[PDB]
Symmetry: none
Subunit: 239 residues, 2 copies
């Protein structure tokens, strides 16, 4: 097992047009996990040549992928166009999956990802080379990467990272507020039942309402799922 | 003597922290005129084909050569963070880092576009430099220039109709609004007396383009190129 903590600073936000697919939510608070994985895959491909291919390789080795805002709150264009109040734009809009990340302080908006792999699946240096997550316009800079040893746990844990919400994972209590729901393409590939190899996965995602309050919850984890811990950082993934 | 039409696409909107100044409005529907001219100046300063000292002189003369600067949305409406934040409060804390920050949303969900119409006493900047503007406001206020036209302008006074923003100062009088909406906004004075009040068009419907009839005389004049009409100063 090996974990990576990756801090990513966004210029403005992102667009992930897979919001247009029937499986996924019709808009996104956060970049989908397959979108983040696609960026890793692209960075790996460039540092070589050419499909890929590689994204499915990452998915086969992936045990967990969770994320949390460090200093920002998402503002979906669906929220924006609503405040501004026609709606053929609810179907296949050019701006589908486009979301602004509003900083709560004077820094650029930042999100931290915590990925866990069955073994070392990517050169640490490569992670530093991610320049977009989502569309061409969704520009970012990676500002920290840390490779960590993780411990596998089950039972009751606390987490401030997003997590898949399938049978075996139970949100027992919200400790600090704003945990939304969002449906993504499943990032887990199989070379194992409730996460199996279904096409879509339901996640609970934290939404920060104040620079000082990180959303947190107590979660019971069993069945096909485990919690992976490195120091205070805990992310829920599959066994 | 010479005009530029510049069509700019925005990624998301802009932030102009000069909203923090007591001389300007506390929030902005549009990027301020000095903010747009500030972008032109940066483009000049960064251009390797223009010598350091020559570039400085050119920049120093922008305000003096400026006769008119007006703008209008082509397909979009602004939403100021002050409005977004008042709601989210379930705001002062939210507004602090958001000073002068505004989202642009397109009526057709395409990239929001704004057109500037500038008029100068002489050819104050090479056309190619206008194409190189990549932000207007903060460094995160990313844009792309998608059209630039240099045009001859004719100077008029009396009664004109315009769909561009205009300075709403002594000597310029609204005769009547033809189509809504027209807001007020106070900016730093881009000419050459600190701060200027502008009328600015706000596109609210897919059915009408903001338009009004204005009486212009005195120190102010209208500059026209084809259908485009912008009010600015005399000389």
């Amino acid at each position: 097992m090996i974990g990576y903590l990756v801090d990513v600073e966004f210029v403005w936000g992102f667009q992930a047009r897979i919001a247009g697919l029937s499986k996924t939510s019709p808009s996104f608070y956060y970049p989908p996990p397959t979108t983040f994985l696609g960026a890793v895959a692209e960075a790996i491909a460039k540092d070589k040549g050419i499909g890929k291919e590689i994204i499915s390789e990452l998915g086969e080795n992936l045990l967990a992928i969770g994320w949390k805002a460090l200093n920002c709150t998402p503002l979906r264009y669906s929220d924006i166009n609503r405040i501004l109040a026609d709606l053929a734009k609810s179907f296949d809009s050019p701006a589908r999956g486009k979301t602004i990340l509003s900083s709560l302080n004077d820094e650029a908006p930042k999100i931290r990802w915590f990925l866990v792999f069955k073994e070392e699946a990517v050169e640490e240096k490569i992670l530093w080379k991610i320049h977009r997550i989502g569309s061409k316009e969704s520009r970012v800079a990676v500002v920290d990467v840390k490779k960590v040893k993780v411990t596998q746990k089950d039972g009751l844990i606390s987490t401030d990272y997003s997590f898949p919400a399938e049978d075996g994972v139970e949100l027992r209590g919200i400790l600090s507020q704003r945990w939304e729901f969002e449906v993504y393409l499943n990032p887990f590939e199989v070379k194992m039942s409730y996460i199996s190899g279904k096409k879509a996965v339901l996640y609970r995602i934290p939404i920060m309402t104040s620079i000082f309050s990180t959303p947190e919850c107590l979660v019971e984890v069993g069945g096909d799922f485990k919690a992976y811990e490195a120091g205070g950082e805990v992310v829920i993934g599959r066994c």
